[PDB]
Amino acid sequence: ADTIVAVELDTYPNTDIGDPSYPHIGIDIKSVRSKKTAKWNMQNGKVGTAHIIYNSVDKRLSAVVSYPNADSATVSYDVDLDNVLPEWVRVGLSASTGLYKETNTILSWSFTSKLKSNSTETNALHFMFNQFSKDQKDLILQGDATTGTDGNLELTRVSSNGSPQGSSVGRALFYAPVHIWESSAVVASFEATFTFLIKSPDSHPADGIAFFISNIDSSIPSGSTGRLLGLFPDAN
Amino acid sequence: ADTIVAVELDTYPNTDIGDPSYPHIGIDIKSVRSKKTAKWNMQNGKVGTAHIIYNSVDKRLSAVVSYPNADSATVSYDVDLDNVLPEWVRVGLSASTGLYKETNTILSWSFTSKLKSNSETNALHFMFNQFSKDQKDLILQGDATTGTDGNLELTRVSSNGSPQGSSVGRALFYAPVHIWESSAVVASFEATFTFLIKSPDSHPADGIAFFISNIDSSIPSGSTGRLLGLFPDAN
Amino acid sequence: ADTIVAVELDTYPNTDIGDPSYPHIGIDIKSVRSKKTAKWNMQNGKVGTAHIIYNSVDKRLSAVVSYPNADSATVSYDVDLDNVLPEWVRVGLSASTGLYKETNTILSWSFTSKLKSNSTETNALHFMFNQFSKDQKDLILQGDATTGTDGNLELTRVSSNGSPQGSSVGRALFYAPVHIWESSAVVASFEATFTFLIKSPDSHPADGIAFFISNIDSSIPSGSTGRLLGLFPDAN
Amino acid sequence: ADTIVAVELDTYPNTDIGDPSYPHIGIDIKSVRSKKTAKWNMQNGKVGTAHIIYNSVDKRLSAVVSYPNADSATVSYDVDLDNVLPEWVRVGLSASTGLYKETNTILSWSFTSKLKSTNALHFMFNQFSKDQKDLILQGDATTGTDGNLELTRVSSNGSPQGSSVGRALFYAPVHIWESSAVVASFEATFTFLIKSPDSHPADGIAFFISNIDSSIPSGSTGRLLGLFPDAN
Ligand SMILES: OC[C@H]1O[C@H](O)[C@@H](O)[C@@H](O)[C@@H]1O
Numbered sequence: 012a013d014t015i016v017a018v019e020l021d022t023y024p025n026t027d028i029g030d031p032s033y034p035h036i037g038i039d040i041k042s043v044r045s046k047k048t049a050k051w052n053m054q055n056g057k058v059g060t061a062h063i064i065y066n067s068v069d070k071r072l073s074a075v076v077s078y079p080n081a082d083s084a085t086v087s088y089d090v091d092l093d094n095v096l097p098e099w100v101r102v103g104l105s106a107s108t109g110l111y112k113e114t115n116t117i118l119s120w121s122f123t124s125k126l127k128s129n130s131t132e133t134n135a136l137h138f139m140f141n142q143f144s145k146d147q148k149d150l151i152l153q154g155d156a157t158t159g160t161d162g163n164l165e166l167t168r169v170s171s172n173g174s175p176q177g178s179s180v181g182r183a184l185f186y187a188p189v190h191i192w193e194s195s196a197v198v199a200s201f202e203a204t205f206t207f208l209i210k211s212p213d214s215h216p217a218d219g220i221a222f223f224i225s226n227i228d229s230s231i232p233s234g235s236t237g238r239l240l241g242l243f244p245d246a247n
Numbered sequence: 248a249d250t251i252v253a254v255e256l257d258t259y260p261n262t263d264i265g266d267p268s269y270p271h272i273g274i275d276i277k278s279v280r281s282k283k284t285a286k287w288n289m290q291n292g293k294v295g296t297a298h299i300i301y302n303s304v305d306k307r308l309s310a311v312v313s314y315p316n317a318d319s320a321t322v323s324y325d326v327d328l329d330n331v332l333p334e335w336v337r338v339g340l341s342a343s344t345g346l347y348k349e350t351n352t353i354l355s356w357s358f359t360s361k362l363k364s365n366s367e368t369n370a371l372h373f374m375f376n377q378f379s380k381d382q383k384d385l386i387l388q389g390d391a392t393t394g395t396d397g398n399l400e401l402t403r404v405s406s407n408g409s410p411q412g413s414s415v416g417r418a419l420f421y422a423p424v425h426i427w428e429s430s431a432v433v434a435s436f437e438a439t440f441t442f443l444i445k446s447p448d449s450h451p452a453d454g455i456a457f458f459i460s461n462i463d464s465s466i467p468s469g470s471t472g473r474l475l476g477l478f479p480d481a482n
Numbered sequence: 483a484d485t486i487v488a489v490e491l492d493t494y495p496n497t498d499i500g501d502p503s504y505p506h507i508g509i510d511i512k513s514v515r516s517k518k519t520a521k522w523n524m525q526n527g528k529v530g531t532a533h534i535i536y537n538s539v540d541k542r543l544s545a546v547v548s549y550p551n552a553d554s555a556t557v558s559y560d561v562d563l564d565n566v567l568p569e570w571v572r573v574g575l576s577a578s579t580g581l582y583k584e585t586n587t588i589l590s591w592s593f594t595s596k597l598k599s600n601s602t603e604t605n606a607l608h609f610m611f612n613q614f615s616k617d618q619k620d621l622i623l624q625g626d627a628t629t630g631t632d633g634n635l636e637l638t639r640v641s642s643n644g645s646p647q648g649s650s651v652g653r654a655l656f657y658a659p660v661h662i663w664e665s666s667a668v669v670a671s672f673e674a675t676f677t678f679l680i681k682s683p684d685s686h687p688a689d690g691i692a693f694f695i696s697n698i699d700s701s702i703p704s705g706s707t708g709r710l711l712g713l714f715p716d717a718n
Numbered sequence: 719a720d721t722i723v724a725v726e727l728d729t730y731p732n733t734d735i736g737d738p739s740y741p742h743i744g745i746d747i748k749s750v751r752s753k754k755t756a757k758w759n760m761q762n763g764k765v766g767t768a769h770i771i772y773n774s775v776d777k778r779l780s781a782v783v784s785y786p787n788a789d790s791a792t793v794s795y796d797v798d799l800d801n802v803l804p805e806w807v808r809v810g811l812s813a814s815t816g817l818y819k820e821t822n823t824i825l826s827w828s829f830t831s832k833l834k835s836t837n838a839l840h841f842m843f844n845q846f847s848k849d850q851k852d853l854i855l856q857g858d859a860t861t862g863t864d865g866n867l868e869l870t871r872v873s874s875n876g877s878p879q880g881s882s883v884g885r886a887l888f889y890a891p892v893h894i895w896e897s898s899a900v901v902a903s904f905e906a907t908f909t910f911l912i913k914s915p916d917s918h919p920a921d922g923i924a925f926f927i928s929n930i931d932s933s934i935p936s937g938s939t940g941r942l943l944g945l946f947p948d949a950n
Pocket residue numbers: 023025108109110111112217218236237238239
């Protein structure tokens with residue numbers, strides 16, 4: 012039912028559904044089987060940054076994921092979002108765990124979209140969260156996601172002692188719908204940035220974090236824990 | 248009831264409910280009887296601009312309204328919004344007509360809010376220079392509609408732009424806004440909109456307001472005319 | 483001897499130096515002979531818009547030029563600016579006329595650059611001109627460029643009665659140097675937008691407007707009227 | 719001489735030229751003798767933030783200085799900058815030391831100005847490099863060490879020295895007011911680390927707005943903060 016475009020930070024290689032044999036970033040267009048991936052050296056316990064950009068001139072979705080003093084990882088894919096997404100969307104973050112686990116902690120998240128009409132003048136939306144509060148009324152929290160423990164967004168369940176739980180799935184969507192494309196626009200673009208902390212006691216953490224864009228009424232597909240990243244109902 | 252804070256552009260003197268004898272701008276804190284007003288030379292048929300600022304340092308809410316090549320009107324009122332509004336609000340525009348009438352056309356509308364923690368900033372900004380027929384980031388209430396020439400019409404207008412009496416409508420931004428937090432070192436907002444008030448009448452009525460409300464605010468029952476879509480009565 | 487990267491709005495086809503036989507937009511990298519071009523239906527007497535973008539992830543310099551209710555012209559070219567420009571640059575607008583002529587009037591100009599450090603996070607510069615004044619001290623005006631007349635920037639000479647003059651050249655550069663790239667940045671980007679009015683009595687108008695980026699001490703090359711667009715010392 | 723309007727973070731009380739008897743923040747309008755001050759609990763060794771705003775509606779110049787999990791200090795003064803500053807200005811930061819000393823380290827600095835007839839300028843430094851070509855450095859100020867702006871002299875290990883004055887001005891002139899603007903405004907933010915082995919730190923950091931061609935006045939170390947030719 013939902014229509015999803017996402018950039019995945021995939022910490023667990025599910026080779027049975029197309030993952031390369033290593034932690035990786037990917038661009039997902041209506042499937043969890045990424046259209047493109049790059050290798051990613053997830054650093055356990057350290058704060059990373061994801062920057063995701065798209066513009067309607069190049070029609071190229073790109074992401075860079077990095078840690079301080081490390082080489083970054085980057086992935087790109089040409090896709091016309093006009094032919095994939097509805098013109099109005101919501102944007103969000105998603106994460107899951109499975110039989111393996113990890114914290115999926117968001118420390119900050121920002122987003123900007125702009126749409127300039129062919130007839131006219133620009134419409135714009137920007138938000139910035141550098142801290143999250145206990146009752147963050149501009150976020151739609153879905154599943155296991157919580158805010159206001161450390162000023163952070165915990166996308167998946169963490170116990171009292173700080174231990175991440177398995178088989179957890181959670182999402183945060185920005186409250187306002189976003190006009191992501193319009194035929195009568197000369198230029199359209201967005202960017203999203205978040206910082207994250209993925210920690211695990213395991214030697215294999217799972218399953219990852221994504222930034223996504225979806226139909227406004229999107230909900231966690233039932234059973235989308237583990238390798239499905241709270242994003243898809245199946246591995247097709 | 249709702250909790251409202253507004254800047255009104257009040258085109259019709261209702262001197263029986265404490266309006267001054269002339270079109271004016273005002274600052275409304277939980278009442279249509281403005282805490283402070285200034286005289287406003289409304290120009291029928293011209294596009295004007297309204298600008299509103301508040302910051303938690305001065306705890307002063309100010310507004311300026313102007314037209315090109317004319318002197319502006321300004322009003323300011325000291326108020327601590329921490330003690331008036333809930334922590335989370337929605338922001339909007341409202342307009343009304345009564346026996347007399349006018350177009351309440353919004354050509355653009357922008358808003359920025361920032362909150363700096365006491366242990367970095369959170370911000371929200373939006374900018375509308377065009378409105379579309381299905382503008383899913385706006386809550387439209389009452390008679391407000393979008394899309395005619397890319398404008399937001401707050402109150403009823405016919406197919407050729409002629410305004411109608413007894414109309415009230417509002418447009419709210421979809422996302423709630425964190426307007427204050429006692430743990431913030433500084434909080435500020437700013438709103439700007441451009442508007443076109445035109446009337447065939449000798450006296451146009453009733454005005455446009457920028458407002459901040461409880462998240463779940465709706466037009467109060469009966470609040471056409473002098474009540475500007477904001478308040479349940481004239482107290 | 484200057485180092486120039488530019489987007490040209492070329493109104494005059496100089497086919498003897500590689501222009502296509504039509505008004506066009508182009509990407510110039512250290513040469514007036516554009517590395518890539520697209521056809522451009524320049525509309526005499528109408529206010530156009532130019533929008534230029536670059537980011538360090540895609541390393542793609544792109545431009546879209548349009549008029550209300552017309553289809554737009556777009557051009558893109560892969561180039562790694564780190565290997566072209568100095569680390570610090572100035573940005574500007576340039577125009578010329580030759581034996582044929584046109585007004586090269588700029589009505590607005592805005593620019594934003596950002597540089598996020600590998601170690602830290604982000605430095606930014608933004609400027610916006612929606613009107614120009616008689617003594618616009620944050621602009622360096624070169625040659626025939628003037629400000630103030632109608633709140634506009636006139637890049638090339640216009641006479642007392644509004645007639646554009648032949649054999650003119652002038653530029654406007656933003657006063658502050660811009661840090662455009664940095665080896666230790668995780669991501670870098672800029673955008674520029676300007677609106678322009680190109681008007682001519684001439685059967686064929688000439689010669690064009692560019693947005694350019696240069697060494698900070700850049701000056702108009704002597705003799706760079708006409709096809710050289712105030713940018714280059716020769717047609718190489 | 720120069721025309722200055724500044725917000726001082728004054729860490730040393732010069733009671734002989736009219737400082738109150740404690741660390742304070744002040745609004746200085748063409749004199750080092752603040753038009754208004756507020757007490758300020760400087761916390762030696764901690765990173766602090768200063769925020770400065772002005773808008774042409776209220777025509778009030780205000781500032782807040784604070785540290786995390788401590789009360790803030792605020793000061794305000796009604797002034798028509800139209801009548802004080804030239805139309806075009808530079809904006810900067812200044813600091814000084816004297817007989818007593820302190821680090822005058824700047825970790826970030828941002829600035830935004832707008833004029834509606836909107837024209838706008840914004841810059842943000844969250845890191846300073848060894849060769850920061852969009853800054854004019856004056857006197858002792860340096861950039862690059864740990865990615866910070868050191869306004870006054872410090873040794874290789876970070877020990878501050880006496881008798882130091884330095885400033886950093888943003889390269890581009892700013893159109894701070896225009897008589898035919900409906901609304902004009904600005905905002906400045908910086909974060910700073912004032913640390914000192916002394917039991918008495920001195921002398922302070924200021925954000926200032928000046929004539930375009932403004933330079934450190936001769937002699938203006940110590941209590942004069944790099945801004946003023948004398949204490950009048
Ligand atoms: O968490 C690791 C792994 O665990 C299980 O095998 C499933 O829940 C997968 O979907 C998941 O990727």
